[PDB]
Amino acid sequence: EFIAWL
Amino acid sequence: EFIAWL
């Protein structure tokens, strides 16, 4: 599982 | 920035 937030 | 890898 990958999560990115900017 | 936030990143998660599980």
Author numbering:
A (entry chain B), B (entry chain A): 1 to 6
Q: Any passages from the paper?
A:
We propose that the pH-dependent changes of the protonation states of glutamate/aspartate residues of APRs initiate switching between the amyloid and the folded, monomeric forms of the hormones. Our results highlight the dual role of short aggregation core motifs in reversible amyloid formation and receptor binding.
To avoid this side reaction and study the effect of protection of the N-terminal, we synthesized and crystallized its N-terminally acetylated form, Ac-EFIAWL. In the structure of APRGLP1 the hydrophobic residues (Phe, Ile, Ala, Leu) form a hydrophobic core, while Trp and pGlu participate in H-bonding with each other and water molecules. A similar interface can be found in the structure of its N-acetylated form. The presence of the acetyl group and Glu instead of pGlu resulted in a lateral shift between adjacent β-sheets, allowing Glu to form H-bonds with waters located near chain termini and Trp side chains from neighboring β-sheets. In the crystal structure of Ac-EFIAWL, the interaction between Phe residues from neighboring sheets is made possible by a slight shift of the sheets compared to the structure of pEFIAWL.
